[PDB]
Design a protein around this ligand. Structure first.
Ligand SMILES: Nc1ncnc2c1ncn2[C@@H]1O[C@H](CSCC[C@H](N)C(=O)O)[C@@H](O)[C@H]1O
Ligand SMILES: [Zn+2]
Ligand SMILES: [Zn+2]
Ligand SMILES: [Zn+2]
Lengths: 431, 52, 52
């Protein structure tokens, strides 16, 4: 496996055993209202005489304070000293190591198998106010740092892990994380712990959801590798009307922040229903009402290819194919060929005219609207097609819809045109 | 003489040569001299540094 | 990113290539004599900058 980088990671910052405070007023529980009647659990101390360990307030015990995310304090609770609900104070962190893989920096891995709901590691840092946070953020942006190191302890109170903190700062974002951050009360103070969402084995990376507020900062692309990745690091939108479809997909359709604003502003503010921000359900009316302009940028072509590889909706694919019909720039088409647009168009065909979630007349209109640019694009070799074998799909769909003779004749012309093109070499291999 | 000029040019640009093509794009060397010397000077590649 | 059992890298698959047919096709298409160059590329790919 990857080489250990634990000491090298430790040397990059001032290691802390506990959270540091800018002042004694910050970080106090109940907004500084000292609960003199501290919540004392009614647990009886359970001392195992063999090991001398106080087993009270354990994981499978019925300690009320543990359920309510409050730690027992020695000398005040009936559970006695050294109970099993002093995890933050005793600093009983899980054993972890630091390593590096993929496009990520340093990352945290489990040195041992960790149970579900087990406390992993206490996020450490300096407790700071809002103005100090703004000053440090401006300084780091001037320094060009490309890493988040701020977490919101609570309203108006943040934790900075840049110069001083703990191993938890090296945990990387995952869109399907195995751990999560939670807020707990220890004495008259507030702590942020990290707990295991599931069973984690040795060697596996430990990750948590950042749910990051950008505060107007630019998006950063997410390289977590999870299948459910949204592609960028963020959280909830700063207001409604901000997105209706995912960016790459929205920009593939020619839509931008203004066009996504305009639809919601025209209907939602005038007593017509638009659901919350969720891309699992496509709103066909927005896609139909969207305006379409020809593509002349290769990054937009890459976004179109990503939308083809991602979106399953019939209407979004219809409007993307219509936009491609408007598009006539040869360089963008050559880029789409390099991106293997034929491969995506094969699946787009298959989902609509082999799988039947729609009506035959509308599918016929779709097929006539998608054969045209296939007929129009520049082609110079069958090796372009060989990366997709879309001809096979064309044969299957002309055979299925044999009653619709215009589609069959167009596919005849298309395969006749493609049959005459040249071929390119593949090195023979020993046998 | 060409070696000393090359060393001085590299020290001007930043004492680090990222790519072989920078001997032409940065005007450090001429066409035929680069064509001769391109495959005999090398830049050590560390995969951990270049994830892309 | 996931090397097989007891192999550092996928450079061992180069030994299945038929370099002779590739050199023949290069000579036909582009009139380039590159038969020794394919061997040099293969050796360098299998071990970058050996001690010769
Ligand atoms: N899944 C991911 N993909 C890309 N960058 C990630 C990432 N998870 C974390 N990061 C990066 O890591 C930052 C958090 S700090 C994590 C430790 C740091 N990468 C280091 O090795 O020093 C994020 O702001 C982001 O820049
Ligand atoms: Zn208790
Ligand atoms: Zn207790
Ligand atoms: Zn992700």
């Amino acid at each position: 496996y990857p080489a250990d980088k634990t000491e090298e990671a430790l040397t990059t910052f001032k290691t802390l055993s506990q959270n540091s405070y800018q002042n004694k007023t910050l970080g106090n529980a109940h907004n500084g209202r000292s609960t003199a009647d501290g919540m004392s659990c009614d647990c009886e101390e359970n001392w195992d005489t063999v090991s001398g360990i106080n087993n009270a307030c354990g994981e499978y015990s019925e300690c009320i304070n543990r359920l309510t995310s409050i730690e027992c304090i020695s000398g005040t609770c009936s559970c006695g000293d050294d109970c099993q609900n002093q995890r933050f104070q005793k600093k009983q962190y899980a054993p972890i190591a630091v390593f590096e893989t993929e496009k990520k920096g340093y990352g945290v891995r489990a040195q041992a198998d960790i149970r579900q709901d087990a406390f992993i590691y206490e996020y450490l840092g300096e407790v700071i106010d809002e103005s100090t946070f703004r000053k440090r953020k401006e300084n780091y942006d001037n320094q060009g740092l490309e890493h988040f190191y701020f977490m919101m302890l609570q309203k108006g109170e943040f934790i900075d892990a840049t110069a001083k903190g703990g191993l938890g700062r090296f945990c990387n974002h995952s869109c399907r994380p195995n751990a999560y951050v939670d807020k707990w009360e220890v004495g008259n103070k507030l702590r942020m712990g990290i707990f295991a969402k599931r069973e984690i084995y040795k060697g596996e990376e430990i990750c948590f959801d950042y749910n990051v507020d950008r505060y107007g900062a630019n998006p950063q692309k997410c390289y977590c590798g999870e299948d459910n990745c949204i592609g960028f690091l963020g959280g909830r939108t700063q207001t409604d009307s901000a997105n209706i479809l995912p960016v790459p997909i929205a920009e593939a359709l020619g839509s931008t922040n203004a066009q996504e604003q305009r639809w919601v502003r025209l209907m939602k503010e005038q007593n017509k229903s638009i659901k919350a921000s969720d891309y699992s359900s496509i709103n066909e009316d927005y896609v139909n009402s969207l305006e379409m302009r020809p593509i002349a940028d290769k990054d937009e072509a890459s976004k179109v290819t990503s939308a083809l590889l991602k979106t399953q909706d019939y209407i979004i694919l219809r409007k993307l194919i219509e936009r491609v019909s408007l598009t006539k720039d040869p360089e963008v088409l050559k880029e789409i060929v390099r991106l293997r647009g034929y491969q995506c168009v094969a699946n787009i065909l298959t989902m609509i005219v082999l799988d039947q979630e729609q009506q035959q007349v509308d599918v016929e209109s779709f097929t006539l609207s998608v054969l045209d640019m296939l007929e129009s694009w520049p082609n110079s070799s069958r090796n372009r097609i060989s990366s997709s074998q879309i001809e096979s799909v064309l044969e299957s769909v002309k055979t299925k819809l044999k009653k619709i003779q215009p589609i069959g004749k167009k596919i005849n012309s298309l395969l006749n045109s493609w049959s005459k093109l040249e071929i390119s070499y593949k090195i023979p291999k020993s046998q | 003489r060409k070696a000393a000029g090359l060393i001085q040019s590299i020290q001007r640009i930043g004492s680090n040569l990222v790519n072989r093509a920078h001997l032409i794009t940065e005007q450090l060397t001429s066409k035929t001299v680069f064509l001769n010397m391109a495959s005999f000077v090398y830049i050590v590649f560390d995969p951990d540094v270049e994830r892309n | 990113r996931s090397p097989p059992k007891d192999e550092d890298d996928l450079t061992f698959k180069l030994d299945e290539l038929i370099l002779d047919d590739y050199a023949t096709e290069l000579e036909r298409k582009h009139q380039l004599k590159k038969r020794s160059t394919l061997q040099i590329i293969k050796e360098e790919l299998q071990s970058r900058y050996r001690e010769i």
